[PDB]
Design a binder for these strands. Structure first.
Ligand SMILES: [K+]
Ligand SMILES: [K+]
Ligand SMILES: [K+]
Ligand SMILES: [K+]
Ligand SMILES: [K+]
Ligand SMILES: [K+]
Ligand SMILES: [K+]
Ligand SMILES: [K+]
Ligand SMILES: [K+]
Ligand SMILES: [K+]
Ligand SMILES: [Mg+2]
Ligand SMILES: [Mg+2]
Length: 1333
RNA sequence: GGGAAUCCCUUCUGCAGCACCGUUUUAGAGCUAGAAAUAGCAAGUUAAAAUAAGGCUAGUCCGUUAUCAACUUGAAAAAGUG
DNA sequence: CAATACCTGGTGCTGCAGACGGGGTTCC
DNA sequence: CCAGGTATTG
């Protein structure tokens, strides 16, 4: 009675729970029932499962929040411009902005004339005739010298400001890198300057048309190279052109380089990458690569601007007008062609918005892509459509001006047109001259990402600090906003403090002191032996100093070969030396030292300790800030120390990331007796050579004492705060908090008696096609492969394992250097790099596509050495293209390092059994600290409750070994059953082997451990491979842990119990008010106004609102023309938008809806999934205010569940055991009819879907000659009809059963409402029939 | 067992700053023949404004995450109840 | 009222911090 | 993908 344990199964949508006794039995209690029914108590088994909707991330909320801010600020830009235009526009047209503001209104509601620009129909029609698009007006106002109407000037400037373009490019544009011809010519000039003996004849080469052509980068490269005889695309000039076109050329073979020189102008590394390449071949080639960069800028701009820039200063608007003119010409030609050749199709093409013709393209919902797909065969079917087809395949036919690709347009182009119009019209309007830079600033200004929202103490997201308390504008931003303090707070609010010194900021990752620390920390544990030496020796202080000065300060990376040859041979005169503590090359390195040595070119400055501070500060500025102007402002204090050239090169250098220790810990605090810092000991510590860990843990030093003193205790978090700050998915965090609440309630159930053990098991948890396609595109263009050209793929298709592996392997076998056939993927094998017997990893990271798995070698180990020798280079190419990860490459190449040792296999099995994920440890810590709170005489924790953590494989193997099978589709009982089995297995496992507590309980020979952990669960078995007692006891205590004659029967009876407390968490719905779609006007009271005065009957709006929670209303409503009061009882869905109004005053809200004399005390708040019971135990859940969900569980008996598992081949064993299971299936075939009858009785009692049940019965009687396996597999599908929750469709073979929905909630108003606690053991039942007259 | 620093990374959480579309109502004089029903043709590419209703704290801020059985108290926060 | 069937905001970019899981060097 | 809103049909 008093002693019990708890089993828990923590999932993303469920928390299973069970209470067990000494004999692994589940108790049952009488629980009091509250309410107004005649039932005063109820018998409950202490087993169940809480169900809840998934916890959501904050991402969608954040995207909507930032979009909201962007809409507000766009409006503010327009408002700034209008404030500038106010007075003079009032002189010209005192209602122009008023007409713009009310343009959306219907004429009935307009307070001014309905024509926006000019206020009369003649002028308006004339305007549209002269300027059919806004880009016509923009080009005119840029080119013309005449004084223009102020309203048209405003419209042009406002159109530029409202849709200003991206900010991906820093600086200014059109810096004479505009022409592709001239930059190509200059690239030829530079190349011919370096290679006089090998010049290129570029005469007659139309570089403009070739490089700006609308074709793939590689195709344009091929076109240009074809125009150059004796020049190949992978030559030097070909690689430069490929770099300008945006490809990833490898300049290695061009310059006979050893280090691969892959360059892409888009990658962040290029600025350093080039500097690396230029380090090997010299700086004579710098001019060449920079000329190629200029050419790249030219080609990128030629993508956007398709017009000659010498006829107009508005090339973008001119290109839009080109779109318009070609659209007009081609539409005229297409209309004439269709009239002549296909006159019957003309109406469908140009009049039917429902079809994807021109009518649906302009008036319907047809996109440019859909319109091209619809009209492609029509153009092919006709004659004279040759050039129209050319334009269609170029995606340049009948184009609009506002299109999806206009995202390419940089803001500098709109800025050029804006500045041009201002320059034209400031000659006539003085306020345009005085406010020119102001309007330009309105277009150009961005709030920096490091500043955040410009709040004033009412934003939990803001961090900006102001230099003065006044309104921030785009023009006073630098003066009002403290950009320095704001940018510093942006980082320091997120960065960790030193854990050893909690009040000390952490050093920058690339700090010189930090890398000195890391290098000395690694170097102090290096040992070496020679011949005459008796014992390996540490490196002395002088030796480490010499190694740093000779190797670490002359090479970016120091290898063990460099250590042996460049020091031990050159200095110590050793011909042979054995090194330990480092393999291949040192992990740490003085990278910042070499960066700054290249930049400032003063090694003595870098080595002088007096400059330490300065250098540190500099790196800090390069790490703390990312804006080059702010970096310049901060480095200005050291301008006197370096040349202007060095200062510029220093500006361009930037670092990211932070270390993990503070400067005060590394080189600040000093040991009391020695007076030496941590770094001082790392540089020299006699013959002990203590490292960081030893230094801060040595009781003979002051470091440990000072670290203990420096720790501070912050304000303790709450349970919810602690769980929220955990590192994990918000879904599993929701599960964790629910688990803790379940444990608290269970302890209260057991009379505040704490359990003996708590066994917890956390489920392994596994758009995305977009990320996969991004990976494959990047890796293939980085690879330089044409696999996407020769074989096109949709991102969705990549959800196929084998095809995704095909593209990740560039269509090649991973074990044989051969090509694979896409059409033969069904014949190929997917192989685990490390076998799944050892590592149960089914990720693409551990899988590989090969023709035959036989070719991997031996199945017991990692791929053989022969395969590695064959395929290592191909694997390295796949690695550098990110097509395979480093771990995948290392597992693939482990055979050359000995392959899998026996220790590796032992560790793999141990991993399969012992849980090591950090989040599970955090849950165990939470439970352990809540259960165990007292301390003993030695002030050590008293662990009354053992928190055991198990992995899912233990209970899964238990179920499969002792035929306690699970079928998830039958019902939700399997969560509770998993919890029960977790408790049983964990308690029994630690009872049998107490020494396992260290492995399995929270708190403080390889063949032998492999054998042991593989045979840890054999004590449950009676006979193993190739016998054991029926009673299993503990060896030392003699206590019984498992009775194989009685306890298995207990587990069976527990899993057979029909009454299981499955509780669906009732939740108030939150989030969006309704569907986002802005529907057109319609006569319906379902439409919701998008603005207070926008009557949806005239303006359209939203519908489909989400009900936050329903409310039971008992009141009277007026009836008929007489308004006679009639008593009612009904459900009112309070929408999310209505919730605040309803809660502020419920009576006023309800009376506004029409209810009179509302019984205030009878108002019942009913969230989603509110439980109601009707007749014959039939239950419903509240799906909404006008729909219900299935509220019952189908407790299918255990015999039928195990039969369904075995018959369907759900998941083997000995062939004799296989045939025993097959013979049992065939001997119990009648279980099929018995299961169908169980389902039918359940559906007639509870589901009440006459049509669906009859159709299912007909479908079952139709496929009775089908194989037993397939019939069982589809019986599994049938349980969707009876599953708890929302109805859904399901297929029995090819017969589709659509969901029967409960579109009415009238009945629950007279049924019994059931309020359940979190476990469901405590209930309050309210007979709703006793409400209302 | 647990933990630390470094290397190669890997995956995910949280935050800020932007762009392009979409949609919605209005504006872009449709014409001719019919009494009209309708028929024959012309035309189409653009813009304004909104983009959670809105809020007070009035900021170039905030408004979709997390958390929530019932009951007794409680203004609430919370505690308590089988 | 029951069956039925439709519908459902999307794309692209920049910058930053952190923990996580897992191979390796060294330690507590 | 779900699964609740909506209108159409009856
Ligand atoms: K009017
Ligand atoms: K050629
Ligand atoms: K369209
Ligand atoms: K190494
Ligand atoms: K930085
Ligand atoms: K100077
Ligand atoms: K919520
Ligand atoms: K939700
Ligand atoms: K509940
Ligand atoms: K590690
Ligand atoms: Mg707004
Ligand atoms: Mg638009």
């Amino acid at each position: 009675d008093k002693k019990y344990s708890i089993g828990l199964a923590i999932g993303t949508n469920s928390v299973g729970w069970a209470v067990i006794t000494d004999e692994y039995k589940v108790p049952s209690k009488k629980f009091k029932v509250l309410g107004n029914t005649d039932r005063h108590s109820i018998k409950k088994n202490l087993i169940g499962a809480l169900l809840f909707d998934s916890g959501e991330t904050a991402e969608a909320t954040r995207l909507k929040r930032t979009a909201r801010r962007r809409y507000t600020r766009r409006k503010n830009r327009i408002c700034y411009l209008q404030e500038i235009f106010s007075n003079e526009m009032a002189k010209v047209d005192d209602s122009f902005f008023h007409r713009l503001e009310e343009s959306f209104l219907v004429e009935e509601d307009k307070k001014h004339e309905r024509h926006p620009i000019f206020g009369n129909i003649v002028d308006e029609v004339a305007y549209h005739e002269k300027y059919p698009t806004i880009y016509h007006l923009r080009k005119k106002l840029v080119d013309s010298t005449d004084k223009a109407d102020l309203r048209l000037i405003y419209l042009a400037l406002a159109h530029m400001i409202k849709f200003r373009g991206h900010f991906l490019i820093e600086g200014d544009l059109n810096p004479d890198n505009s022409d592709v011809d001239k930059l190509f010519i200059q690239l030829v000039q530079t190349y011919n300057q370096l290679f006089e003996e090998n010049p290129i004849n570029a005469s007659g080469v139309d570089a403009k048309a070739i490089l700006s052509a609308r074709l793939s980068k590689s195709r344009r490269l091929e076109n240009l190279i074809a125009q150059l005889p004796g020049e190949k695309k992978n030559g030097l000039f070909g690689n430069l052109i490929a770099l300008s076109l945006g490809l990833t050329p490898n300049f290695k073979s061009n310059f006979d380089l050893a280090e691969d020189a892959k360059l892409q102008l888009s990658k962040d590394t290029y600025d350093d990458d080039l500097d690396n390449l230029l380090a090997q071949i010299g700086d004579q080639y710098a001019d060449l690569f920079l000329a190629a960069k200029n050419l790249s800028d030219a080609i990128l701009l030629s993508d956007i601007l398709r017009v000659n820039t010498e006829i107009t200063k508005a090339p973008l608007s001119a290109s839009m007008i080109k779109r318009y003119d070609e659209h007009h010409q081609d539409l005229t030609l297409l209309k004439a062609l269709v009239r002549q050749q296909l006159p019957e199709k003309y109406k469908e093409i140009f009049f039917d918005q429902s079809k994807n013709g021109y009518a649906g393209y302009i008036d319907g919902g047809a996109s440019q892509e859909e319109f091209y797909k619809f009209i492609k065969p029509i153009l092919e079917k006709m004659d004279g459509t040759e050039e129209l087809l050319v334009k269609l395949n170029r995606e340049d036919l009948l184009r609009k001006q506002r299109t999806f690709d206009n995202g390419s347009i940089p803001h500098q182009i709109h800025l050029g047109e804006l500045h041009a119009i201002l320059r034209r019209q400031e000659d006539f309007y003085p306020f345009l001259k005085d406010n020119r830079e102001k309007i330009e600033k309105i277009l150009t200004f961005r709030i920096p990402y490091y500043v955040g929202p410009l709040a004033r103490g009412n934003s939990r997201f803001a961090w900006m600090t102001r230099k003065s308390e006044e309104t921030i504008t785009p023009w006073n931003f630098e003066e009002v906003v403290d950009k320095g303090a704001s940018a510093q707070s942006f980082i320091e609010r997120m960065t960790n403090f030193d854990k050893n010194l909690p009040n000390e900021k952490v050093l920058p990752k690339h700090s010189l002191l930090y890398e000195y620390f890391t290098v000395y920390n690694e170097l102090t544990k290096v040992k070496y032996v020679t011949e005459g030496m008796r014992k390996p020796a540490f490196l002395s202080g002088e030796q480490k100093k010499a190694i740093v000065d000779l190797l670490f300060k002359t090479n970016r990376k120091v290898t063990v070969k460099q250590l042996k040859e460049d020091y031990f041979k050159k200095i110590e005169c050793f011909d042979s030396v054995e090194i330990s503590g480092v393999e291949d090359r040192f992990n740490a390195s003085l990278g910042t030292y070499h960066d700054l040595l290249k930049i400032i070119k003063d090694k003595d400055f870098l080595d002088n300790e007096e400059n330490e501070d300065i250098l540190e500060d500099i790196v800090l500025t390069l790490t703390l800030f990312e804006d080059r102007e702010m970096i310049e402002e901060r480095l200005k204090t050291y301008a006197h120390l370096f040349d202007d050239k060095v200062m510029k090169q220093l500006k361009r250098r930037r670092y990211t990331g932070w270390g993990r220790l503070s400067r005060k810990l590394i080189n600040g605090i000093r040991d009391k007796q020695s007076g030496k810092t941590i770094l001082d000991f790392l540089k020299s510590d006699g013959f002990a050579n203590r490292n960081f860990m030893q230094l801060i843990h040595d009781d003979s030093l002051t470091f440990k004492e000072d670290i203990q003193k420096a720790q501070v205790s912050g304000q303790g978090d709450s349970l919810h705060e602690h769980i929220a700050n955990l590192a994990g998915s918000p879904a599993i965090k929701k599960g964790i908090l629910q688990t803790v609440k379940v444990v608290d309630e269970l302890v209260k159930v057991m009379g505040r008696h704490k359990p003996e053990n708590i066994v917890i098991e956390m489920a392994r948890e596994n758009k995305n096609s977009r990320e996969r396609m991004k990976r494959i595109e990047e890796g293939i263009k980085e690879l330089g492969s044409q696999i996407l050209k020769e074989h096109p793929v949709e991102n969705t298709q990549l959800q196929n394992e084998k095809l995704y592996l095909y593209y990740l392997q560039n269509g090649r076998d991973m074990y044989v250097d051969q090509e694979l056939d896409i059409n033969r993927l069904s014949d190929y094998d997917v192989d685990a790099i490390v076998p799944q017997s050892f590592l149960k990893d089914d990720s693409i990271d551990n899988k590989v596509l090969t023709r035959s798995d036989k070719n991997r070698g031996k199945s017991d180990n990692v791929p053989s050495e022969e395969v590695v020798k064959k395929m290592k280079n191909y694997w390295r190419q796949l690695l550098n293209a990110k097509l395979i990860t480093q771990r995948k490459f290392d597992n693939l190449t482990k055979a050359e390092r000995g392959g899998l040792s026996e220790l590796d296999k032992a560790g793999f099995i141990k991993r399969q059994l012992v849980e090591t994920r950090q989040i599970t440890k955090h849950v165990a810590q939470i439970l352990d600290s809540r259960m165990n709170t007292k301390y003993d005489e030695n002030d050590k924790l008293i662990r009354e409750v053992k928190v055991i953590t198990l992995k899912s494989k233990l209970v899964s193997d238990f179920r499969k070994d002792f035929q306690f099978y699970k079928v998830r589709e039958i019902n939700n009982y399997h969560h509770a059953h998993d919890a029960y089995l977790n408790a049983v297995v964990g308690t029994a496992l630690i009872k049998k082997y107490p020494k396992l507590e260290s492995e399995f309980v929270y708190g403080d020979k390889a063949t032998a451990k492999y054998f042991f952990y593989s045979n840890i669960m054999n004590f449950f078995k009676t006979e193993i491979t190739l016998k054991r007692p029926l009673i299993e006891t503990n060896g030392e205590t003699g206590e019984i842990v498992w009775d194989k004659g009685r306890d298995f029967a207990t587990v069976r009876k527990v899993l057979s119990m029909p009454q299981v407390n499955i509780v669906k968490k009732t939740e108030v719905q939150t989030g969006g008010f309704s569907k986002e779609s802005i529907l057109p006007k319609r006569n319906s009271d379902k439409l919701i106004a998008r603005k207070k005065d926008w009557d949806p009957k005239k303006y359209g709006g939203f519908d489909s609102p989400t009900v936050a929670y329903s409310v039971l209303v008992v009141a009277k409503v007026e009836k008929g023309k007489s308004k006679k009061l009639k008593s009612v009882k009904e459900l009112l869905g309070i929408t999310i938008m209505e919730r605040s109004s309803f809660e502020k005053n419920p009576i006023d809200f309800l009376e506004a809806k029409g209810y009179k004399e509302v019984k205030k005390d009878l108002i019942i708040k009913l969230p989603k999934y509110s439980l109601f019971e009707l007749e014959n135990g039939r239950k419903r859940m509240l799906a909404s205010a006008g729909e219900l969900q299935k509220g019952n569980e189908l407790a299918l008996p255990s015999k039928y569940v195990n039969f369904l598992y075995l018959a369907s081949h759900y998941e083997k064993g000995s062939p004799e055991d296989n045939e025993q299971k097959q013979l049992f299936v065939e001997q119990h075939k009648h279980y099929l009819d018995e299961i169908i009858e169980q389902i039918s009785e359940f559906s007639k009692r509870v589901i009440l879907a006459d049509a669906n049940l009859d159709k299912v019965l007909s479908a079952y009687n139709k496929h009775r000659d089908k194989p037993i396996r397939e019939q069982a597999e589809n019986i599994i599908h049938l349980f969707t009809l009876t599953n708890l929750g929302a109805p859904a469709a399901f297929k029995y073979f090819d017969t589709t059963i659509d969901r029967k929905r409960y579109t009415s909630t009238k009945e629950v108003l007279d049924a019994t409402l059931i309020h359940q606690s979190i476990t469901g053991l405590y209930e309050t039942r309210i007979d709703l029939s006793q409400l209302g007259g």
